[PDB]
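Repro case for the chain-ordering regression, as requested:
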Amino acid sequence: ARAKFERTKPHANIGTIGHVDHGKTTLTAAITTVLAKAGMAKARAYADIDAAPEEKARGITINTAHVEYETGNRHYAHVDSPGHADYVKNMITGAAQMDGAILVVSAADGPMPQTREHILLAKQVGVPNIVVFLNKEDMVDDAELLELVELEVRELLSSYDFLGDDIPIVAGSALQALEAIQGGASGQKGDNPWVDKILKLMEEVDAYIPTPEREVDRPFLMAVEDVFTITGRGTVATGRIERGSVKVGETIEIVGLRDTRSTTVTGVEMFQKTLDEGLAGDNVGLLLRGIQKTDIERGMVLAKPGSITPHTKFESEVYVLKKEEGGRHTPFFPGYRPQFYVRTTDVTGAISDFTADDGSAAEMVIPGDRIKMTVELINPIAIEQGMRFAIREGGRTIGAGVVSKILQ
Ligand SMILES: Nc1nc2c(ncn2[C@@H]2O[C@H](COP(=O)(O)OP(=O)(O)O)[C@@H](O)[C@H]2O)c(=O)[nH]1
Ligand SMILES: [Mg+2]
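-- result from build under test --
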């Protein structure tokens, strides 16, 4: 009968990716500017977005512009960054979630090394989907040429396991659309062909990039931060619920550092609140029946049973911090054994099997660069694909990783 009324339009986090100078920032400006004609955005000017501010977080410095807008279908947080290094750092550290990405490819240049590398990183950090905007169409007078670039991009996407045959590719000119608005174009479809292509891009983004599942609908996960003995019935484990929800009476697992163990949550507490249910984002104390404080310790996570498992070895994309950004001047090398900060604690590990983007072996990865490598931890800990971690030496972050593949 009646659909449920949605009080808020769906939300998704996207970003523009692609090679420097291909039009990422111009496209971002053009989107906000076209959508501002509908009343759905603050029109943001190129020079504004192009001057992206620095952000600090957990020891990583990244230049990143954040714009917001909506379509008729969905609200968007949109990230855009000046340089390649910002994209590596944002994608690896996860400082900007991407539910999907707009890959901007210059028609006049075709895909370029950072085109490949941003698709690579998109695959490795688990970006679900990509929409391509083939920019600078105004510079290519030749439909046969546009097709060849589009085929090359599809082939490139397919080689990183995106569905190259399904990815929408919209060809256009971000610059011409912005000039068309400045010259008086309305933002209504059919009013201006360059603006129509921006509107076409966003329709494709609305249709093709999925809205992420709500965090509270995902399987429960909480990293244990503190634990307390208050009565004999069990220990109160505290933390912030990273995702999902937990209810009194539910069976959860304690995962990592010790054999996985099942227990019943018999209470959920927040400040001044006894709850029946803790929700993602809530800082809670959870009473864990029959668990003694000695059985439980930071590093461990609480999780819906079977939703996450302990592992010791995995492939990852790792960024090495420059000394400028608080790292060391020396490269990472095979068999280096730093600390791996996994959610709450340092775990000792050894890195190995450095794999260059072309798949050849690498002898090292210098600060400021990124590489695929294998981590083996000394103790098992709850690991899943897309989990981020810091690599740390004497408490200082010297790199950043994202799990790309569980090996054991
Ligand atoms: N001819 C043309 N130039 C464009 C177009 N989009 C961007 N540019 C120009 O290309 C340069 C790089 O664009 P920018 O958005 O800064 O690229 P980014 O580094 O990928 O963000 C700028 O001087 C833009 O004005 C386009 O559609 N056509
Ligand atoms: Mg830019």
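Ordering looks correct now. The radius of gyration is 23 Å.
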